[PDB]
């Protein structure tokens, strides 16, 4: 017949693929999937960060613990994946750039603030 429905990846399985390769502990791996699964296909994540802390089901775990795990992923396949609230995404992308860039400090200065005016 034709039951050879070839499968694929695309930043859900691909994102998860990278998760395993890196050295993340059980508590960290578990958390990783939670945030890597809330990543809307269109671009960034859906829910807020605090949401994620509440959906772990813990009290000893603070934002800091999840911050790292959610910060580590910011540098995976597509630099900028799972960013949340635009600004952080763009900002990160400028971090992996060479510091010997002429408009490095300028861009960064207008990225942290004074964005509204630029938008106009």
């Amino acid at each position: 017949p034709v039951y050879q429905g070839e499968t694929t990846q695309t930043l859900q399985d691909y994102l998860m693929w990278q998760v395993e390769l890196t050295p993340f502990t059980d508590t960290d791996r578990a958390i990783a999937t939670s945030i890597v699964d809330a990543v809307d296909d269109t671009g960034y994540l859906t829910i807020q960060i605090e949401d994620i802390v509440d959906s772990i089901g813990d009290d000893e775990i603070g934002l800091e613990e999840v911050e790292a795990v959610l910060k580590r992923i910011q540098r995976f396949d597509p630099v900028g994946v799972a960013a949340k609230d635009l600004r952080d995404c763009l900002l990160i992308q400028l971090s992996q750039f060479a510091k010997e860039t002429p408009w490095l400090e300028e861009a960064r200065l207008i990225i942290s603030d004074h964005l509204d005016l630029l938008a106009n």
Binding site: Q18, L21, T22, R75, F76, D77
Partner: protein, 201 residues
């Protein structure tokens, strides 16, 4: 890949194209680059492998140093159709093959398609080295006779180099025994010189 011949290999070698590599031992090269520090992350190692720099070929040579591989042909009636070999990188797109093991695969050098399998786990490599290695099975499992015996060209050479004549060039004289090779590359004796006395140990 198409099977060719190689006269410089030994009983436990096989010519593996460099282009066929870097795709089969891919997780191995990834781990090598990750342990050597030249690959900070996995995406970095993948990018370096995709660009095919100079360092990945050396890493591949280091990894494939003593990693056994196995060969297989599509028509495999007996168990000799699947043996193991030590892969050696050779520039090209065809897989070389030992002339003596050819009889084992029953080939005629009109190269068809072949198969090259890579053992991943340690025990699989141990089995390929101790049981599937060509230097272990020399006799046939059907009658207990050797099958690695030479073929037409070797037979023809050995038969031409061992032939007696009547009146050769410089026959009759006595020789030491290791001196016959010297007069072969010169003009003082023929290979087919009969009635020659030479001591041997």
């Amino acid at each position: 890949s198409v099977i060719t011949v190689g006269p410089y290999l030994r009983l436990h070698q096989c010519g593996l194209p460099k282009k066929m590599a870097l795709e089969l031992f891919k997780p191995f090269i990834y781990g090598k680059l990750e342990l050597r520090g030249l690959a900070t992350t996995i995406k970095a190692a993948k990018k370096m492998v995709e660009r095919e720099e100079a360092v990945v070929w050396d890493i591949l040579d280091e990894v494939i140093r003593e990693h056994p591989v196995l060969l297989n042909r599509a028509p495999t009636l007996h168990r000799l159709g699947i043996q193991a070999f030590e892969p050696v990188l050779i520039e090209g797109k065809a897989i070389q093959l030992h002339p003596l093991v050819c009889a084992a695969y029953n080939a005629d050098f009109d190269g068809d398609q072949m198969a090259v399998h890579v053992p991943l786990t340690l025990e699989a490599q141990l089995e390929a080295r101790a049981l599937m290695m060509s230097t272990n099975n020399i006799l046939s499992p059907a009658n207990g006779e050797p099958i690695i015996v030479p073929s037409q060209d070797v037979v023809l050479g050995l038969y031409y180099m061992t032939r007696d004549c009547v009146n050769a060039k410089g026959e009759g004289m006595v020789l030491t025994g290791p001196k016959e090779a010297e007069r072969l590359y010169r003009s003082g004796l023929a290979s087919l010189h009969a009635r020659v006395k030479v001591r041997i140990t």
